[PDB]
Design a protein around this nucleic acid. Structure first.
Ligand SMILES: [Mg+2]
Lengths: 98, 82, 107, 95, 17, 98, 87, 95, 107
DNA sequence: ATCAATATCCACCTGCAGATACTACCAAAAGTGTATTTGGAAACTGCTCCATCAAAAGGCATGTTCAGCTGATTCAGCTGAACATGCCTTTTGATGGAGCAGTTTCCAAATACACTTTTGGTAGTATCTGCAGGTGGATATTGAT
DNA sequence: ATCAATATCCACCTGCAGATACTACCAAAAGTGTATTTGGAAACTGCTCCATCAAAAGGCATGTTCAGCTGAATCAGCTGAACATGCCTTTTGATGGAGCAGTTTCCAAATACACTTTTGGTAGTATCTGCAGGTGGATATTGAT
């Protein structure tokens, strides 16, 4: 019975996901979320397939960038665990609010 | 077994985004915080995109509506035209 | 009898098109003869610079076909291209391998 | 069934001078198209401002050059300016 | 090819390396 | 002889400088700094006086803004003392540097 | 003629006290001894970048005088738009 | 003494409408002047682009209006759009 | 019977000026009759919003003349004007009084 | 150390998705020939920027002193990482029609011109006035005790 | 919770700096009201490609066990705040010198424009192949002991 220690599989996912370029959110859920949010601005909308993908590409690149800044804010506080306060500091200094 | 579309953005999916961002450990509050930030991003971009759609008197959001929106939100995307 | 403004200027990039895109662009009432030649050369040069380094990165991956990942690796590994494209997302580019030192295991 | 212009033909020819045994995916070509169009817009836009600031009706080689100096970092600017002057030299010397 | 490419290319100095 | 404790004059100074709008760098040194940097780009340059004052207003509003973000970086680290690593984390997150 | 006196080390004219005041306006209570040299470096980089652009507009105009407007255009380009000096 | 024009006269009219007994320093007037010039460019710029994006060669109140919806946040958009629709309908139905 | 287009539209802001600035600015080949009227109105609306709130900062600080500080307090105290002007520096405007709670003394 | 579980790495193979290559058709670049527009070259202003200097507040430098902050150390408790399963959600692949876009048509709208009229700038002049800067004196805050 | 040092508050009291408000005034710009051009909404229709919907497939929700991270408490060293003291340099407000922006007038290049001639670049299409999987077996890594 052999079990990897906490953070050994984490490093492996990091190495793995930093090497690849595949979208990391399942398409259908994201398509549903896009249509929902868009419904509130104009009803009976259609989306080109490339429209939704543009949006997923942009949204994933944004969230990956934010996790990097977030990670730097956690490490700055002498931690290795990202918290809401790290995401919130990264957004404040980026000028996304406050 | 019905649930919100946002929760369709799952703990494991968010975990993968974190990992591509170099993150080793994740607080349980991260998942809801991240859904919050994602919703605002998509709100701000889909709003601008849809405003381009309405302007062109269309009922279909095009890749270009998104690209033009991304550009004025300072998130210029390459590879979808423009 | 006809010879493209490109063949004259020593360029692969279309001087004629650049000229028309400057006119149909509402940049200015008039357009100097050289402006589209210069502009065409600049865009060719920057294309060479990127395709040069993207080529090298495709070579390192035992690959002959340049993909977006190769374009990302060339741009983000170059101080000047990375700054020029600082507010730009390469679709299907992913990120540079980068693990903060303090996240590495102890032994 | 109408014409949809791009820079792909030109990107492909520059690829061959620079890496003659190297191909390029559809997706990678889309990215180079975005690239050219983006820098076109930035340079044309700065050139337009320059001409406007100096109460000029005309964008010449000079506004393109100044625009390139404002927009390209350090060495990129230097080499862009030299590739630009060269092409305008070759073209002014062509009967 | 026949382009005045940059002789040397430096990497960007990343915060946290 | 009666001393204010460490922090008391620093808070008095925050209150006083946050109330006022006068430039905080001495005019003449700042003008010598502008002339030196410009001269190193181009010799024989002169300056409209308003050009130097525009530079001084932009440089101070930039440095004030940077110290607010720097302070948020110290506090996130559970300090109250700004250090070089705070300014650099702030510039990194602002996207002023890699 | 006269030729201009030589300009060296003028960054040191941005004194510890001038940097303290700026930190105060910015909300800062306590200040590490290393902040002063870090700030002088950041200020030089900011000035150089804006002056470089301002002087590029000067040279393009074929003038010998850097105008408020040359600075205002350099500040706008750099995403540091300034109100109160024209434009 | 070459006529250098500003929006001062109009800023001061509107000052007198909202705060009849309030003055404005020349620096404050300098700022209001920058503000109008800046919002002008931003709206005109979005409008320019929006027209280009739709292969049109005319900037109408329809392009201004979308530009206003893209540039202003929620409530300022709402009120701006009202004042502009009202000014146009009026201007048209005053001829 | 010479009416201004400003009077025709019921505006303090100059429609003629604004029509012309759209002309000389190379935004587009042609400019509709409405465009400058709609734009002059919007500019006027926004300058009215700012002068209302700045007027109030003037009165609050026991003053009669709006200075740049009054414009800064007005813009930075309004969520919407603050976002519209979030990348703008107001010369001689200073900042909002604001001390981070942890910096204050005592328990 | 040893020992094994699992991850990782390299060589080889091979089907087809996604490249490269090829062709005819036409939109759009180039060629020629008048048709306008401009952007220095010369030649003068006055504006304003440099310079230099004298006198005096005003802020800067430096040394002393110790309050209290940072950061090293220890440690307990809780909170996220790991992991083993099957079921539920997504992915894949195969049809009906919304609506994008292709295109031509003609009119309401915008341009072009050259008149006439009025606005908004400025220079000049005076004419008024809000407020900065100063000065007491009454009142608040801080830190010793 | 008393007290005294010293900072802060606020109401008076000035002298302009800078604001307001005349002019008269004119020059450029905005407006007027036909003569000419044309861009874009309109209506029609075809043929993509978008939404929907039903089998194929792996990704995720789940709860348990505990490794090791976070943050609390403590403590000592020593950095940075306060402030006193001495005085250099900046601020201020003149004067004279001229460099250089800023104008306004000839134009000879330079670029736009209207029309014609040509061909480069696109869109079908029609082949060719780089490489993403897949397999097999060696070795490295990790964590138990
Ligand atoms: Mg020097």
């Amino acid at each position: 019975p052999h079990r990897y220690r906490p953070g050994t599989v984490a490093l492996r996912e990091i190495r793995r996901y930093q090497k690849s370029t595949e979208l990391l959110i399942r398409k259908l859920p994201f398509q549903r979320l896009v249509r929902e949010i868009a419904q509130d601005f104009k009803t009976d909308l259609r989306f080109q397939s490339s429209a939704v993908m543009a949006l997923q590409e942009a949204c994933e690149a944004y969230l990956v960038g934010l996790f990097e800044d977030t990670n730097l804010c956690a490490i700055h506080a002498k931690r290795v665990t990202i918290m809401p306060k790290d995401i919130q500091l990264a957004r404040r200094i980026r000028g996304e609010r406050a | 077994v019905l649930r919100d579309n946002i929760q369709g953005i799952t703990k494991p999916a968010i975990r993968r985004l974190a990992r591509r961002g170099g993150v080793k450990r994740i607080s349980g509050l991260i998942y809801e915080e991240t859904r919050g930030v994602l919703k605002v991003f998509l709100e701000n971009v889909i709003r601008d995109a849809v405003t381009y759609t309405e302007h062109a008197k269309r009922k279909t959001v095009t890749a270009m509506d998104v690209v033009y929106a991304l550009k004025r939100q300072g998130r210029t995307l390459y590879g979808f035209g423009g | 009898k006809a010879k493209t403004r490109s063949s004259r200027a020593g360029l692969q990039f279309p001087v004629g098109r650049v000229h028309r895109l400057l006119r149909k662009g509402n940049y200015s009432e008039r357009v100097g003869a050289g402006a589209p030649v210069y502009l065409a050369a600049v865009l060719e040069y920057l294309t060479a610079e990127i395709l040069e380094l993207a080529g090298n990165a495709a070579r390192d991956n035992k690959k002959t076909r340049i993909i977006p990942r190769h374009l990302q690796l060339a741009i983000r590994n170059d101080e000047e291209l990375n700054k020029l494209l600082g507010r730009v997302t390469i679709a299907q580019g992913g990120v540079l391998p980068n693990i903060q030192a303090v996240l590495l295991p102890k032994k | 069934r109408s014409r949809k212009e791009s820079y792909s033909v030109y990107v492909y020819k520059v690829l061959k001078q620079v890496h003659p045994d190297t191909g390029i995916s559809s997706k990678a070509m889309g990215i180079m198209n975005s690239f050219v169009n983006d820098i076109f817009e930035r340079i044309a836009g700065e050139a337009s401002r320059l001409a406007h600031y100096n109460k000029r009706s005309t964008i010449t080689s000079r506004e393109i050059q100044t625009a390139v100096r404002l927009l390209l970092p350090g060495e990129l600017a230097k080499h862009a300016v030299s590739e630009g002057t060269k092409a305008v030299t070759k073209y002014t010397s062509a009967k | 090819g026949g382009y005045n490419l940059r002789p040397r290319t430096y990497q960007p100095q990343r915060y946290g390396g």
